[PDB]
């Protein structure tokens, strides 16, 4: 169904580490893929262009961004500050799984994360709507300099966002 592609670059303290791209299954979910697409260009009054990261745990997951409005916890979606779910036809095969984050039922703000392992306890809760085709190496490189204390390579920030129209 001519699935779109999206990406964004990571900066390790005023230094470009590399780009990470993602392929979305708009074929399966031609609705929630757009949410992600828009969050790149980061119009509509939000996106990943906030140059900030939440946290990076080595050997679990990696992401950050979005929100930015309420003391670093903003976040509204293109369908509102909340949005229903779709389904769980997809599963968590392991690392390289792009899954959403949620804070309740029919409550999918926007923020997602990369699964760098078999998050079997997240399967069925989070929506899988894409995978990491290429960039896992950069993600790994990023995680290598992460920690559970909620600090990463000094101060990693989103350099720029992509959106491959």
């Amino acid at each position: 169904m001519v699935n779109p592609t999206v990406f964004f670059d990571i900066a390790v303290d005023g230094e470009p580490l590399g780009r990470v791209s993602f392929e979305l299954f708009a074929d399966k979910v031609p609705k929630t893929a757009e949410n992600f697409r828009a969050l790149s260009t980061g119009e509509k009054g939000f996106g990943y262009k906030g140059s900030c990261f939440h946290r990076i745990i080595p050997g679990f997951m990696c992401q950050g961004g979005d929100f930015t409005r309420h003391n670093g916890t903003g976040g509204k979606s293109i369908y509102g500050e909340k949005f229903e779910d779709e389904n769980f036809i997809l599963k968590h095969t392991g690392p390289g799984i792009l899954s959403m984050a949620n804070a309740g039922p029919n409550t999918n703000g926007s923020q997602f994360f990369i699964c760098t392992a078999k998050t079997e306890w997240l399967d069925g809760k989070h929506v899988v709507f894409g995978k990491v085709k290429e960039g896992m190496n950069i993600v790994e490189a990023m995680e290598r300099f992460g920690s559970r204390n909620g600090k990463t390579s000094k101060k990693i920030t989103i350099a720029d966002c992509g959106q491959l129209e």
């Binding site: 745990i57 679990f60 916890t73 804070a103």
Partner: peptide, 11 residues
Amino acid sequence: XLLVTAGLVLA
């Protein structure tokens, strides 16, 4: 812990 929600991450 190792959860991924959106509001008040705990251990």
